[PDB]
Amino acid sequence: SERVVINISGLRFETQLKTLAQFPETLLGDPKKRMRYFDPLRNEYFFDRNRPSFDAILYYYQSGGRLRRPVNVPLDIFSEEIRFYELGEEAMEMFREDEGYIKEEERPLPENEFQRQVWLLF
Amino acid sequence: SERVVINISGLRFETQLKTLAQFPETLLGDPKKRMRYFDPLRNEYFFDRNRPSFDAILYYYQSGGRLRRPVNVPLDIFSEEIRFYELGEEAMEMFREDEGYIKEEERPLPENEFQRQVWLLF
Amino acid sequence: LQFYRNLGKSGLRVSCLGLGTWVTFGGQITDEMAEHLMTLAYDNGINLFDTAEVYAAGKAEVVLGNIIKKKGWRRSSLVITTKIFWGGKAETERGLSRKHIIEGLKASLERLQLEYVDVVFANRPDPNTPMEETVRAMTHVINQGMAMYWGTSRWSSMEIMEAYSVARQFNLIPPICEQAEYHMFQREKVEVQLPELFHKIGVGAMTWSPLACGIVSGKYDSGIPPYSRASLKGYQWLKDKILSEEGRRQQAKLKELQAIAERLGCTLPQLAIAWCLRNEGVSSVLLGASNAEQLMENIGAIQVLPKLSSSIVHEIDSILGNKPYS
Amino acid sequence: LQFYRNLGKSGLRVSCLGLGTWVTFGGQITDEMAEHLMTLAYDNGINLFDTAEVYAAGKAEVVLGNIIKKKGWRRSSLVITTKIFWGGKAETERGLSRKHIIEGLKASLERLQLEYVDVVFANRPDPNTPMEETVRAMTHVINQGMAMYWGTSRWSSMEIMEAYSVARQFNLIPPICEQAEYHMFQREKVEVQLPELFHKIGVGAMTWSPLACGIVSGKYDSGIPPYSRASLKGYQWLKDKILSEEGRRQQAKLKELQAIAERLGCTLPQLAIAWCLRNEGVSSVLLGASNAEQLMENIGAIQVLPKLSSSIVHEIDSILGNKPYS
Ligand SMILES: NC(=O)c1ccc[n+]([C@@H]2O[C@H](COP(=O)([O-])OP(=O)(O)OC[C@H]3O[C@@H](n4cnc5c(N)ncnc54)[C@H](OP(=O)(O)O)[C@@H]3O)[C@@H](O)[C@H]2O)c1
Ligand SMILES: NC(=O)c1ccc[n+]([C@@H]2O[C@H](COP(=O)([O-])OP(=O)(O)OC[C@H]3O[C@@H](n4cnc5c(N)ncnc54)[C@H](OP(=O)(O)O)[C@@H]3O)[C@@H](O)[C@H]2O)c1
């Protein structure tokens, strides 16, 4: 129940340690990864980053997995924040799907020299 | 006129005790229900929850009943917050109506074995 | 069953029973008797003694201090508390202004021949002094090593909460205890208002007049005994209460309570005192005594405490018919 | 190779080895021997001496103080530390309440004939006292010039972090050190829990019983020698450990460690002490000694420190087979 204070460029966020400990493999969930951002003088973790985005990042832990991009935050900026906080590929995949994306197919000519070469001009 | 400080995941809210005492049957209106969330070290009630939603929750008490969902908050998330703060079914009903909902009808075959059974395949 | 208790949620451990000095010390009883009462209490594990600048115009503190000095008890084994508010005839010698709290406590400490008290109490609320000034002054005397903690007396829960919020606002020290009147005929505050403060901000209750000045002892069942507090010069007000219409009503109810005492196998005073300690919210009860007999009997209330079952408590509520609405 | 180290991240510089007074001073050894041990340590650059109100019921502090006063060493050249918690039989004479910390430290300072100690430690955690009260009291005695810094002893890392957050919350002073037990058969806390506190909030470790009361010296390889701590009246508990089933197991492993000592060219005690200093998280190790021979040998652990290679450390881990999981 120990509380944690995360300061996003001046904007103060507060949560419980158990809330973050829920997702260990993320930056805020792993003590060794967030250690770098701790300010022992103010007893808070400080990130010189985008403010509007963190709300959703924190809600992700509080909700237990809900990663919704705030209406007022550009998809390119929010996606960078998701990657910075290391939420993982599963969450990222779940995210792009909802944002209306996903899809990657197309093998490739194995018989190199011949097939693969012909299948490229056809 | 005593003042109350409610801290929503770091976001600081402040109001008068009489404003909350207006709706006793809610979590914030009932001393016994909010007692659990009090932090005697900082003299505030702390909730590890969704930030964007609380604005409207507090305005509900200040306005005397106006429960409007913030444009930037998903209906599914706001509805959960309304239930958590225990605003009551009347407010909830009033809310869904405005949000464009409401409606539940359809009795059911009483003469069990016979009627109710036939009325299901017809 | 737990003889020692934390005063509220602080780290200060007091015996569930303490000994007061109002009326008796430096007044009704001889210094010899005072030394006897204190020795008896100390030897029985009681570590809490309460006094006030106003009791016998300061003589109570002088007597209390002479005993402690004479007995040579280790200061660390005692919990001395004193109250401030009425310190003299002059306009500036009363109240909870920074001036009187500092001067008042300094003078009490002088009469007590002690470097400090464990808890200093505002003897009553002060409408003429802003809360900030009072909390800053109490915090000041604690930082000066004049007191270890401070508490309130006769303050409403609203006022206690104000002192607490003011303390948090300015990084000052909140009060840790309220000294409230409590006995079978005065239950409101301790049962309805204080419990919330106890659980919310840790303020505990240290109750006084558990026998309502002797009224609940049953000694006034038929008239004003000679040498009883009610007969003392200056306590006509108490005599008026006992003989009043409501006074007669109380005495009548006490005769009903006597049967409860016999069933529990104790005397009425023991039942009355044990009753006050039945709820966690009460940290300690300050006793009064004009002789050793009274003190030895009263201390026995601790043996009764375990027998106060829900059933018995409900029964006493019926007889008293004054249980406060929550 | 660095004889002097910062205590945690504070500016206080202590020798990597300090001398304690538990069991010995005012107890097992003569004041003459105590003066000899202290002189030897001081002349060898050790500037850290630890004592406690509880050791020999205060006599240890009295002996420590008599030596400092007699030798006339400059106060500024010493780092005296003392622990508070058990200060007497009375209910209020124990714990970390504001009352006992102030009275306890004041009394220790009196027995030490010193105006102040460099570091005052809460000898152990106190469940009955809110953290705020404790941190405010420690901060208070520091502001009064009674201590320069404060530390914890036997506190979990969770409790140490609580004191730190409470200090930040109220603008108080955080603790700078934890006095933890540490030797080859008690590695958990110092190796798994404390390092994080060291890097995060700068709290350093000052370890005690590096030889597990003598057990790791190898002197108990075959029975309880006469005059050893395990034979002293009152340490039957230690004797029980040595002869226990687990006791025999340890002694067996020590015979395996002896080969490591010979390879490094040192005695077992020197290896055991040097082992404790192998990681930065440990600021200093408090030694114990009943005679000058023991102290002169133990101080030699500093020459071994440089030889403790990863390979050697891995080897000792195999023999002990008790390396804690991170
Ligand atoms: N915070 C405040 O403003 C405040 C106000 C008042 C008091 N107090 C504190 O509370 C303490 C206790 O108050 P209190 O004196 O009113 O207490 P109490 O318990 O209500 O009354 C004690 C008095 O009743 C009589 N008595 C006690 N035990 C008896 C027994 N077993 N049999 C017969 N008579 C008995 C004695 O008077 P007689 O023998 O003379 O009849 C004795 O002096 C004070 O001394 C003071 O420290 C605080
Ligand atoms: N924070 C706390 O709660 C706490 C608790 C305990 C101790 N401490 C501190 O830590 C200090 C050290 O603890 P400790 O006394 O247990 O230390 P230790 O190093 O584990 O044991 C020292 C004892 O072992 C024996 N010994 C030492 N060197 C030896 C050698 N070369 N050969 C043979 N025997 C040797 C001696 O006892 P014999 O000669 O009598 O056998 C000596 O008294 C204490 O004095 C105290 O200041 C703190």
DSSP character at residue C193: I
Residue A68 CA neighbour count, 13 Å, CB half = 16
* Contact: C200, B35; criterion CB under 8 Å: yes
DSSP C171-186: T-PPP-EEE-B-BTTB
**Do residues D263 and D309 touch, judged by C-beta distance below 8 A?**
no
- The separation between CA D276 and the C-alpha centre of its own chain, rounded to angstroms, equals 12
Look up residue D160 and give its amino acid: I
Give the integer Cα–Cα distance in Å for C216 and C220. Answer: 8
Q: Which residues pair with D4 in a beta bridge?
A: D15
Q: Which chains touch D (3 or more CB pairs under 8 A)?
A: A, B, C
Hey, what are C209's tokens?
A: 């007049």
CATH of the domain at D263: 3.20.20.100
Answer whether CATH 3.30.710.10 is correct for domain B1-101: yes
Residues of B in contact with C164 (CB under 8 A): 43
Residue D288 CB partners (closer than 8 Å, separation 6+): D19, D20, D22, D23, D24, D209, D211, D213, D214
**Do residues D147 and D173 touch, judged by C-beta distance below 8 A?**
no
Q: Assign residue B47 a region: left if phi > 0, alpha if psi is -120 to 50, beta otherwise? A: beta
**Do residues A57 and A84 touch, judged by C-beta distance below 8 A?**
no
Nearest partner of D228 among D163, D182, D294, D274, judged by Cα = D294
**Do residues A90 and A60 touch, judged by C-beta distance below 8 A?**
no
**Do residues A86 and A26 touch, judged by C-beta distance below 8 A?**
yes
Residue D226 CB partners (closer than 8 Å, separation 6+): none
> Can chain C be said to touch chain A, i.e. do they have 3 or more Cβ pairs within 8 angstroms?
no
* Contact: B49, A72; criterion CB under 8 Å: no
Number of domains chain C is built from: 1
What is the domain extent for residue D89? 1-326
**Do residues C156 and C197 touch, judged by C-beta distance below 8 A?**
no
* Contact: D165, A35; criterion CB under 8 Å: no
**Do residues C214 and C220 touch, judged by C-beta distance below 8 A?**
yes
**Do residues D24 and D289 touch, judged by C-beta distance below 8 A?**
yes
The resolution in angstroms reads: 2.5
Report the 10 Å Cβ neighbour count for D268: 21
**Do residues C91 and C130 touch, judged by C-beta distance below 8 A?**
no
Q: With H, G, I as helix, E, B as strand and everything else as coil, classify residue C3.
A: coil
Technique of determination: X-ray
Contacts of B36-44 spanning 24+ positions with Cβ under 8 A: B38/C200, B39/B7, B40/C200, B40/C201, B40/C202, B41/D132, B41/D166, B41/D169, B42/B5, B42/B7, B42/C168, B42/D169, B43/B5, B43/C164, B43/C165, B43/C168, B43/C169, B44/B5, B44/B6, B44/B7, B44/B12
Strands (E), D113-251: 117-122, 147-153, 177-179, 204-207
**Gaps in chain C following residue numbers (C to N > 2.5 A):** none
Nearest partner of A18 among A57, A55, A62, judged by Cα = A62
User: Is D294 flagged in the annotation as binding?
Assistant: yes
Cβ burial D113-152 (10 Å sphere, 16+ → b, else e):
ebebbbbbbbbbbbeebbbbbbbbbbbbbbeeebbbbbbb
Please name the member of A3, A35, A42 whose beta carbon is closest to the beta carbon of D199: A35
Give the integer Cα–Cα distance in Å for D2 and D237. Answer: 37
Give the integer Cα–Cα distance in Å for C197 and D137. Answer: 24
DSSP H or E run through D22:
none
DSSP H or E run through A16:
strand A11-16
Closest residue of D to A1, CA-based?
A: D158
The active-site residue out of D55, D149, D182, D220 is: D55
Distance D59 CA to ligand 2 centre (A): 17
Find the length of chain A.
122
